[PDB]
Amino acid sequence: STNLKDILADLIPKEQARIKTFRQQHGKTVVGQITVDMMYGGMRGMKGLVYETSVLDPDEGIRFRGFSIPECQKLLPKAKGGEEPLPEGLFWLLVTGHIPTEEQVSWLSKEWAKRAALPSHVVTMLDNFPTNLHPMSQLSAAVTALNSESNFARAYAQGISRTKYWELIYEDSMDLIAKLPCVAAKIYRNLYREGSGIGAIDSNLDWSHNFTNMLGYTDHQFTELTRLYLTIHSDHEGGNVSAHTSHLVGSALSDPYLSFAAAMNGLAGPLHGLANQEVLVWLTQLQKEVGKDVSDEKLRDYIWNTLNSGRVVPGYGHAVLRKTDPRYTCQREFALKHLPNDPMFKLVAQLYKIVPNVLLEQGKAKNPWPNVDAHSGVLLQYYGMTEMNYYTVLFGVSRALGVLAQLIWSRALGFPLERPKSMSTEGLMKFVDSK
Amino acid sequence: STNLKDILADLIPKEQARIKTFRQQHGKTVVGQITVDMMYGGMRGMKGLVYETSVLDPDEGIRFRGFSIPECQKLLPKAKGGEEPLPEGLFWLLVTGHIPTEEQVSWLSKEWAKRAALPSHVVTMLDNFPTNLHPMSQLSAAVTALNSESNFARAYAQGISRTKYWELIYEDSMDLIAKLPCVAAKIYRNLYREGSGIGAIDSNLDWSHNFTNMLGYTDHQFTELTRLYLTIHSDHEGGNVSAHTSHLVGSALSDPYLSFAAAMNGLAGPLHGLANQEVLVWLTQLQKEVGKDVSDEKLRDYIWNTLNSGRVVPGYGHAVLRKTDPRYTCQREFALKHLPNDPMFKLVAQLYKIVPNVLLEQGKAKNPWPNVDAHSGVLLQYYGMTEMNYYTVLFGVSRALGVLAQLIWSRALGFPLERPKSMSTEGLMKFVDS
Ligand SMILES: O=C([O-])CC(=O)C(=O)O
Ligand SMILES: O=C([O-])CC(=O)C(=O)O
């Protein structure tokens, strides 16, 4: 009723039968072809894996178990007095496929606050990391080191039924999620607040608020942003590098700690994890050059110049997104409400109205709309989080929610080891001369 | 001309042009189909990626740049007074596609010797890790922490050309390889030799010998087994979890340290790199339950009893292979030579005599033959390396050579982000109905 573990135990047999029915009906059905190009092209547009938690709706953007961001914004419980969905409630939705009640989100906050304690060796490790070790590497290493607490690692050697794997994955996942804000905040403080203490977890606060307390922030609106930020970056299908990495490492029966730590290594990749930062570096450089009261005309000209130099507008480059990423839009609406006077926000909204058209005029993408990362950096900066090296850590804490929700389900459903076939160029040249 | 980096610079254009042409003509040739079962079956049988260094024949087993392991044992340089191929030469072969000269292997030994230094924060982290932190976690966290020495991360931030990624990938790879034995030896000593120091690197020893020196071993035949172990575990195609993880993370332009440390997390999984220990624990439970004397009938029985109750013989199957793993056969030949009277060895050999038939008669064995992990533990244990938690660390050190060699080529050839399409069961049902 209130215990997520017992609700999930009741959901797992129905989903297992659903899948078994579909495989028994359609197992041998061909869903696509693999070309030589796809093998060289990083499996692009190859249906490679099953991932239950989120799906890209090609018009309406990401869907969390069927719910769009606007629907989640509407339906998910909020803090007392807040407007922004609690990430707890998003996690519940991912795991259960159902919208939580306020009582379920509240139980989940309490459960995460009670598991949040870090082992001493991790605190020590973190306190001893130098300033030149990037925050993401500190997060990954710390998470790896947390695997000393893994319930799941012990039990496989002990011969626990496969049928029970999901239960230990759940425990480990709940423990990791609870601990991630303490790790993330200790890294923040060590790097940027002279190693002062993160203080104490409040057993009665939601996860985002405990997290902002620990970072050393005391600004209701930043906590509101953080709630929204963690909700919306939580999951984006299974194909992206951080989700795929967690799924791949997870399929070897590595515990949630090792899976996530691997996934963060992947998120730290500058083709996955650095866009927030590149957009902000660009905006800062732009505003300083052209001043904060630049005209549309002069802005449009600057953009035309950048494009004709063979250069991209960072944060504008879409997939199949026939509209603006709803992840952008909810950040925009947030900004419109709470920081409409901010100069850099004003530059962001001005580009929004100008750049799509310029991109359509040019021979480029048929989608010229902005991704989530075009708006994220200006909001964080506004609330005093100016340490751009740390931005991807926030993304990472968010993504824990999606990849761990899916990891529980991968084990509950008994997905096997991910083990595709590779070929060399020489092999593939022969393979095609034959047949 | 002589330096590995220069020889590689000459080879890259040629391979790039040859692929550009291949994808022009044959880019649209279908190599395979995707079925629903493959999506739910972890991509089994699905031609997913290009991986240049090695290719796994299901029937004949692994080839390194077209060379079987027997071919490598013959052709690859050995230490002076040695019979086992140097891992250095395996790496040269993976990187260049060519068998190295003794001079080239000697040069590479010196090169990894000179790069082996650990920064102080990494030493300290290892010295502070508690005893209950698995050695593989230790290895992963230390490698991730070494990413502070990444020249590739620093160069990419300054906007280096795409055409030059492979060069810094190579430097960071050569640095990681050189440092790994030091990291690995520190783990070992901290956990199992009460924190005793690892000593120093000798610049005129090969990589496997410096490593056994740092572990605390002084046994020619132990060094020989290591040289063998580190060659044959080095690479196994792109599709295994450790190589695929490194390739996936690397595709996002993560540096070799983060890519390798991700791989290690994958190698640490029970279905991947912990089978060595799992084999050994099982053989030990078996050896106490009958003893040295057990007959083919008794053993055949015990096996039947195991299968009938739906248990499994550890080390006797594979996702891809469907004959005796050549890496098994290599270790069998070592053992036959250097420890034929070892009781544990005796049991493993009896099992080779018996189990493959039991599995074929039954019928549900897609691969009835042993894989590498059936044989490796008894060799290690025989030389005093009885700390079974640590075995995957050796595999890890070995696997660094294959995945880092491929990572240099993945950047050199400009392989993009790996980004397959995922589906939900609900979405997949609807797509199939369309
Ligand atoms: O960027 C992508 O490809 C999807 C994703 O991971 C994200 O939304 O962050
Ligand atoms: O190839 C596989 O899937 C597993 C394996 O034997 C290896 O990585 O050495």
Coordinates of C-alpha atoms in Angstrom, one line a residue, chain A:
Chain A
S1 CA 0.0 0.0 0.0
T2 CA 2.7 2.4 1.0
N3 CA 5.8 0.2 0.6
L4 CA 7.1 0.5 -2.9
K5 CA 8.9 -2.9 -2.7
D6 CA 5.6 -4.7 -2.1
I7 CA 3.8 -2.8 -4.8
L8 CA 6.6 -3.7 -7.2
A9 CA 6.4 -7.3 -6.2
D10 CA 2.8 -7.4 -7.3
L11 CA 3.5 -5.6 -10.6
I12 CA 6.5 -7.9 -11.6
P13 CA 4.5 -11.1 -12.5
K14 CA 2.1 -9.3 -14.8
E15 CA 4.9 -7.7 -16.7
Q16 CA 6.8 -11.0 -16.9
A17 CA 3.7 -12.7 -18.4
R18 CA 3.1 -9.7 -20.8
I19 CA 6.6 -10.1 -22.1
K20 CA 6.6 -13.9 -22.3
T21 CA 3.3 -13.7 -24.3
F22 CA 4.8 -11.2 -26.8
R23 CA 8.0 -13.2 -27.3
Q24 CA 6.1 -16.4 -27.7
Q25 CA 4.0 -14.6 -30.3
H26 CA 6.6 -12.5 -32.1
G27 CA 10.1 -13.7 -31.0
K28 CA 11.3 -14.5 -34.5
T29 CA 9.7 -11.4 -36.1
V30 CA 12.2 -9.2 -37.9
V31 CA 12.1 -5.6 -36.6
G32 CA 15.0 -4.2 -38.7
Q33 CA 18.0 -5.0 -40.8
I34 CA 21.6 -4.4 -39.9
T35 CA 23.7 -2.7 -42.6
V36 CA 27.5 -2.3 -42.9
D37 CA 26.9 1.4 -42.4
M38 CA 25.1 0.8 -39.0
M39 CA 28.1 -1.2 -37.7
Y40 CA 30.5 1.6 -38.6
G41 CA 28.0 4.2 -37.5
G42 CA 27.6 3.2 -33.9
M43 CA 24.4 1.2 -34.4
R44 CA 22.7 4.4 -35.4
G45 CA 18.9 3.6 -35.9
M46 CA 19.4 0.0 -34.9
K47 CA 16.7 -1.3 -32.5
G48 CA 19.2 -2.8 -30.1
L49 CA 17.6 -3.1 -26.7
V50 CA 14.5 -3.1 -24.6
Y51 CA 14.1 -0.4 -22.0
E52 CA 10.8 0.1 -20.3
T53 CA 11.0 3.3 -18.3
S54 CA 11.1 6.1 -21.0
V55 CA 10.3 6.4 -24.7
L56 CA 11.0 9.3 -27.2
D57 CA 7.6 10.4 -28.6
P58 CA 8.8 11.9 -31.9
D59 CA 6.4 14.8 -31.6
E60 CA 5.8 15.3 -27.9
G61 CA 9.4 14.5 -26.7
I62 CA 10.4 12.2 -23.8
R63 CA 7.6 10.2 -22.1
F64 CA 8.0 8.6 -18.7
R65 CA 6.0 5.4 -18.7
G66 CA 3.6 7.1 -21.1
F67 CA 3.5 10.6 -19.4
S68 CA 5.0 13.7 -21.1
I69 CA 6.8 16.3 -19.1
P70 CA 3.8 18.7 -19.0
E71 CA 1.7 15.8 -17.7
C72 CA 4.3 15.0 -15.0
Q73 CA 4.4 18.7 -14.2
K74 CA 0.7 18.5 -13.7
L75 CA 0.3 15.1 -12.0
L76 CA 3.3 14.5 -9.9
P77 CA 3.2 15.6 -6.2
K78 CA 5.0 18.8 -5.3
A79 CA 6.6 20.0 -2.1
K80 CA 4.3 21.8 0.4
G81 CA 3.9 25.2 -1.2
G82 CA 5.9 24.3 -4.4
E83 CA 5.0 24.0 -8.1
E84 CA 7.8 21.7 -9.3
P85 CA 7.4 17.9 -9.3
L86 CA 9.3 16.0 -6.7
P87 CA 11.9 13.6 -8.3
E88 CA 10.8 11.0 -5.8
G89 CA 7.4 11.0 -7.5
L90 CA 9.1 10.6 -10.8
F91 CA 11.1 7.6 -9.5
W92 CA 7.8 6.0 -8.3
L93 CA 6.3 6.5 -11.7
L94 CA 9.4 5.0 -13.4
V95 CA 9.4 1.9 -11.2
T96 CA 5.6 1.3 -10.9
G97 CA 4.2 2.9 -14.2
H98 CA 1.7 4.7 -12.0
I99 CA 1.4 8.2 -10.6
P100 CA 2.2 8.2 -6.9
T101 CA -0.1 9.8 -4.3
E102 CA 1.3 12.4 -2.0
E103 CA 1.4 9.8 0.7
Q104 CA 3.6 7.5 -1.5
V105 CA 6.0 10.3 -2.4
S106 CA 6.2 11.3 1.3
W107 CA 7.0 7.7 2.3
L108 CA 9.7 7.6 -0.4
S109 CA 11.4 10.9 0.9
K110 CA 11.5 9.4 4.4
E111 CA 13.0 6.1 3.0
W112 CA 15.7 8.0 1.1
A113 CA 16.6 10.2 4.1
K114 CA 17.0 7.2 6.3
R115 CA 19.5 5.4 3.9
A116 CA 21.6 8.5 3.2
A117 CA 24.6 7.8 5.5
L118 CA 28.0 7.5 3.8
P119 CA 30.6 4.9 5.1
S120 CA 33.7 6.5 6.6
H121 CA 36.0 5.2 3.9
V122 CA 34.0 7.1 1.2
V123 CA 34.1 10.3 3.2
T124 CA 37.8 9.9 3.7
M125 CA 38.4 9.1 0.0
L126 CA 36.4 12.2 -1.0
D127 CA 38.2 14.5 1.5
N128 CA 41.5 13.3 0.1
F129 CA 40.8 13.9 -3.6
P130 CA 42.8 16.8 -5.1
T131 CA 41.2 19.9 -6.8
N132 CA 42.5 18.8 -10.2
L133 CA 40.4 15.5 -10.1
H134 CA 37.3 16.5 -12.1
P135 CA 34.0 16.3 -10.1
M136 CA 32.6 13.6 -12.4
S137 CA 35.6 11.3 -11.8
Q138 CA 35.2 11.9 -8.1
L139 CA 31.6 11.0 -8.3
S140 CA 32.4 7.8 -10.3
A141 CA 35.2 6.7 -8.0
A142 CA 33.2 7.4 -4.9
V143 CA 30.3 5.4 -6.3
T144 CA 32.5 2.5 -7.1
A145 CA 33.9 2.6 -3.6
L146 CA 30.3 2.5 -2.2
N147 CA 30.0 -1.0 -3.6
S148 CA 31.4 -2.2 -0.3
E149 CA 27.8 -1.6 0.9
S150 CA 26.2 -3.6 -1.9
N151 CA 23.6 -6.1 -0.8
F152 CA 23.5 -7.7 -4.2
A153 CA 27.2 -8.4 -4.7
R154 CA 27.3 -10.8 -1.7
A155 CA 24.2 -12.8 -2.5
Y156 CA 25.2 -14.0 -6.0
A157 CA 28.1 -16.1 -4.6
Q158 CA 25.7 -17.3 -1.9
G159 CA 23.5 -18.8 -4.6
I160 CA 20.4 -16.6 -4.3
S161 CA 17.5 -17.5 -6.6
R162 CA 17.5 -15.5 -9.9
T163 CA 13.8 -14.8 -9.0
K164 CA 15.1 -12.6 -6.1
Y165 CA 17.8 -10.6 -8.0
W166 CA 15.4 -7.6 -8.4
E167 CA 14.9 -7.4 -4.6
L168 CA 18.5 -6.8 -3.9
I169 CA 18.9 -4.6 -6.8
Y170 CA 16.0 -2.6 -5.4
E171 CA 17.7 -2.3 -2.0
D172 CA 21.0 -1.3 -3.4
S173 CA 19.3 1.2 -5.8
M174 CA 17.4 2.8 -3.0
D175 CA 20.6 3.0 -0.9
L176 CA 22.6 4.6 -3.9
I177 CA 19.9 7.1 -4.7
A178 CA 19.8 8.1 -1.0
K179 CA 23.5 8.5 -0.8
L180 CA 24.1 10.3 -4.1
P181 CA 23.2 13.8 -2.8
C182 CA 25.7 13.4 0.1
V183 CA 28.5 12.3 -2.3
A184 CA 27.6 15.1 -4.8
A185 CA 27.5 17.7 -2.0
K186 CA 30.7 16.6 -0.4
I187 CA 32.4 16.9 -3.8
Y188 CA 30.8 20.4 -4.2
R189 CA 32.0 21.6 -0.9
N190 CA 35.5 20.1 -1.1
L191 CA 36.1 21.6 -4.5
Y192 CA 34.4 25.0 -4.0
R193 CA 33.6 25.7 -0.4
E194 CA 37.0 25.0 1.2
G195 CA 36.1 21.5 2.4
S196 CA 33.4 22.7 4.9
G197 CA 31.0 20.0 6.1
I198 CA 27.7 19.1 4.3
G199 CA 25.8 19.1 7.6
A200 CA 23.0 16.7 8.4
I201 CA 20.2 15.1 6.6
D202 CA 16.8 16.1 7.7
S203 CA 14.6 13.0 8.0
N204 CA 11.5 15.0 7.1
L205 CA 12.7 16.8 3.9
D206 CA 12.4 15.7 0.3
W207 CA 15.6 14.6 -1.4
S208 CA 16.1 17.8 -3.5
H209 CA 15.9 19.9 -0.3
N210 CA 18.4 17.7 1.6
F211 CA 20.6 18.0 -1.5
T212 CA 20.4 21.8 -1.7
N213 CA 21.0 22.1 2.1
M214 CA 24.1 20.0 1.8
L215 CA 25.4 22.1 -1.2
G216 CA 25.1 25.0 1.2
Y217 CA 22.2 26.8 -0.6
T218 CA 19.2 28.4 1.2
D219 CA 17.0 29.7 -1.6
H220 CA 13.5 28.2 -2.0
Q221 CA 13.6 29.0 -5.8
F222 CA 16.9 27.1 -6.3
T223 CA 15.4 24.1 -4.5
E224 CA 12.4 24.4 -6.8
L225 CA 14.7 24.5 -9.9
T226 CA 16.7 21.5 -8.5
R227 CA 13.4 19.5 -8.1
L228 CA 12.5 20.3 -11.7
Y229 CA 16.0 19.7 -12.9
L230 CA 16.3 16.2 -11.3
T231 CA 12.9 15.2 -12.6
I232 CA 13.4 16.1 -16.2
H233 CA 17.0 14.8 -16.7
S234 CA 16.0 11.5 -14.9
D235 CA 15.7 9.3 -18.1
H236 CA 15.9 9.6 -21.9
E237 CA 15.5 6.0 -23.4
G238 CA 18.1 3.3 -23.1
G239 CA 20.1 4.2 -26.2
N240 CA 21.9 7.2 -24.7
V241 CA 25.5 6.4 -23.4
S242 CA 24.8 6.6 -19.7
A243 CA 21.7 4.5 -19.8
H244 CA 23.2 2.0 -22.2
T245 CA 26.3 1.7 -20.1
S246 CA 24.3 1.0 -16.9
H247 CA 22.3 -1.6 -18.8
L248 CA 25.4 -3.3 -20.3
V249 CA 27.4 -3.4 -17.1
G250 CA 24.2 -4.4 -15.2
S251 CA 23.5 -7.4 -17.6
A252 CA 26.8 -8.9 -16.3
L253 CA 25.1 -8.9 -12.8
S254 CA 27.4 -6.1 -11.6
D255 CA 25.6 -4.3 -8.7
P256 CA 23.9 -0.9 -9.0
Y257 CA 27.0 0.8 -7.6
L258 CA 29.3 -0.5 -10.3
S259 CA 26.6 0.0 -13.0
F260 CA 26.0 3.6 -12.2
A261 CA 29.7 4.3 -11.7
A262 CA 30.3 3.0 -15.2
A263 CA 27.4 5.1 -16.5
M264 CA 28.9 8.2 -15.0
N265 CA 32.2 7.5 -16.8
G266 CA 30.1 7.5 -19.9
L267 CA 28.2 10.6 -18.9
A268 CA 31.6 12.3 -18.4
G269 CA 32.2 11.9 -22.1
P270 CA 32.3 15.4 -23.7
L271 CA 29.9 14.1 -26.4
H272 CA 27.3 13.1 -23.7
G273 CA 27.9 15.3 -20.6
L274 CA 29.5 18.6 -21.5
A275 CA 26.8 20.4 -23.6
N276 CA 25.3 22.4 -20.6
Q277 CA 28.8 23.9 -20.2
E278 CA 29.7 24.6 -23.8
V279 CA 26.4 26.5 -24.2
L280 CA 27.1 28.6 -21.1
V281 CA 30.7 29.4 -22.2
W282 CA 29.3 30.6 -25.6
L283 CA 26.4 32.7 -24.0
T284 CA 28.9 34.4 -21.7
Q285 CA 31.2 35.2 -24.6
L286 CA 28.3 36.5 -26.7
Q287 CA 26.8 38.8 -24.0
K288 CA 30.2 40.4 -23.1
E289 CA 30.8 41.1 -26.8
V290 CA 27.4 42.5 -27.9
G291 CA 26.2 43.8 -24.5
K292 CA 23.0 42.8 -22.7
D293 CA 20.6 45.1 -24.7
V294 CA 21.5 43.8 -28.2
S295 CA 18.9 44.1 -30.9
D296 CA 17.3 41.1 -32.6
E297 CA 18.8 42.5 -35.8
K298 CA 22.4 42.5 -34.5
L299 CA 21.8 39.2 -32.8
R300 CA 20.4 37.6 -36.0
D301 CA 23.5 38.9 -37.8
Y302 CA 26.0 37.4 -35.3
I303 CA 24.2 34.1 -35.6
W304 CA 24.4 34.2 -39.4
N305 CA 28.1 34.9 -39.1
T306 CA 28.7 32.0 -36.8
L307 CA 26.7 29.6 -39.1
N308 CA 28.6 30.8 -42.3
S309 CA 31.9 30.2 -40.6
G310 CA 31.1 26.4 -40.4
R311 CA 30.3 26.7 -36.7
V312 CA 27.2 25.5 -34.8
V313 CA 24.9 27.3 -32.4
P314 CA 25.5 25.3 -29.2
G315 CA 22.3 23.8 -27.8
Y316 CA 20.3 24.0 -31.1
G317 CA 20.6 20.6 -32.9
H318 CA 17.7 18.1 -32.7
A319 CA 17.2 14.4 -33.2
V320 CA 13.7 13.6 -34.5
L321 CA 12.4 16.4 -32.4
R322 CA 9.8 18.1 -34.7
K323 CA 9.3 20.6 -31.9
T324 CA 11.4 22.2 -29.1
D325 CA 12.5 19.6 -26.5
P326 CA 9.9 19.9 -23.7
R327 CA 12.8 19.8 -21.3
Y328 CA 13.8 23.2 -22.7
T329 CA 10.3 24.5 -22.5
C330 CA 9.7 23.7 -18.8
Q331 CA 13.0 25.4 -18.0
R332 CA 11.9 28.4 -20.1
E333 CA 8.6 28.7 -18.3
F334 CA 10.4 28.4 -15.0
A335 CA 12.7 31.3 -16.0
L336 CA 9.8 33.4 -17.3
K337 CA 8.1 33.1 -13.9
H338 CA 11.0 33.6 -11.5
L339 CA 13.8 35.4 -13.2
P340 CA 12.4 37.4 -16.2
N341 CA 14.8 40.3 -15.5
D342 CA 17.9 38.3 -15.6
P343 CA 20.2 39.5 -18.5
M344 CA 21.5 36.1 -19.6
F345 CA 18.1 34.5 -19.4
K346 CA 17.0 37.4 -21.7
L347 CA 19.7 36.5 -24.1
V348 CA 18.6 32.8 -24.0
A349 CA 14.9 33.7 -24.7
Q350 CA 16.1 36.1 -27.5
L351 CA 18.0 33.4 -29.3
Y352 CA 15.0 31.1 -28.9
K353 CA 12.9 33.5 -31.0
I354 CA 15.7 34.1 -33.6
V355 CA 17.8 31.0 -34.1
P356 CA 15.2 28.5 -35.3
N357 CA 14.3 30.7 -38.3
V358 CA 17.9 31.3 -39.2
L359 CA 18.6 27.5 -39.0
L360 CA 15.6 26.8 -41.3
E361 CA 16.9 29.4 -43.9
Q362 CA 20.2 27.6 -44.0
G363 CA 20.7 24.2 -45.5
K364 CA 21.0 22.3 -42.2
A365 CA 18.7 20.2 -40.0
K366 CA 15.0 20.0 -40.7
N367 CA 14.8 20.4 -36.9
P368 CA 16.4 23.7 -35.7
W369 CA 15.0 23.7 -32.1
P370 CA 16.9 23.9 -28.8
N371 CA 17.9 20.9 -26.7
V372 CA 17.6 20.8 -22.9
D373 CA 21.3 22.0 -22.5
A374 CA 20.6 25.4 -24.2
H375 CA 18.7 26.6 -21.1
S376 CA 20.2 24.7 -18.2
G377 CA 23.4 26.6 -17.5
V378 CA 21.8 30.1 -17.3
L379 CA 19.5 28.9 -14.5
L380 CA 22.2 27.3 -12.5
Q381 CA 24.5 30.3 -12.9
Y382 CA 21.6 32.7 -11.8
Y383 CA 21.3 30.9 -8.4
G384 CA 25.0 31.2 -7.8
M385 CA 26.1 27.8 -9.0
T386 CA 28.8 29.2 -11.3
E387 CA 31.1 26.1 -11.1
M388 CA 30.5 24.7 -14.6
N389 CA 32.8 21.7 -14.1
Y390 CA 30.2 20.5 -11.6
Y391 CA 27.1 20.8 -13.8
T392 CA 27.3 17.2 -15.2
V393 CA 27.3 15.9 -11.6
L394 CA 23.8 17.3 -11.3
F395 CA 22.9 15.6 -14.5
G396 CA 24.3 12.4 -13.0
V397 CA 22.3 12.6 -9.8
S398 CA 19.2 13.0 -12.0
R399 CA 20.0 10.1 -14.3
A400 CA 20.5 7.8 -11.4
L401 CA 16.7 7.8 -11.1
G402 CA 16.0 6.5 -14.6
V403 CA 18.8 4.0 -15.0
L404 CA 18.2 2.5 -11.6
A405 CA 14.5 2.2 -12.1
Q406 CA 15.3 0.3 -15.3
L407 CA 18.0 -1.8 -13.7
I408 CA 15.5 -3.1 -11.2
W409 CA 13.2 -4.1 -14.1
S410 CA 16.0 -5.6 -16.2
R411 CA 16.8 -8.0 -13.3
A412 CA 13.1 -8.6 -12.4
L413 CA 12.5 -9.5 -16.0
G414 CA 15.7 -11.7 -16.2
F415 CA 17.3 -9.9 -19.1
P416 CA 20.5 -11.9 -20.0
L417 CA 24.0 -10.6 -20.6
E418 CA 24.3 -8.1 -23.4
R419 CA 26.7 -9.8 -25.8
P420 CA 26.5 -8.8 -29.5
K421 CA 28.8 -10.1 -32.2
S422 CA 31.7 -7.9 -33.5
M423 CA 33.4 -8.0 -36.8
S424 CA 36.6 -6.5 -38.1
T425 CA 36.9 -4.5 -41.4
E426 CA 38.7 -7.4 -42.9
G427 CA 36.0 -9.9 -41.7
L428 CA 33.2 -7.7 -43.0
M429 CA 34.9 -7.3 -46.4
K430 CA 35.0 -11.1 -46.7
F431 CA 31.5 -11.5 -45.2
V432 CA 30.1 -9.4 -48.1
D433 CA 32.2 -10.9 -50.9
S434 CA 30.6 -14.2 -50.0
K435 CA 26.8 -14.5 -50.2

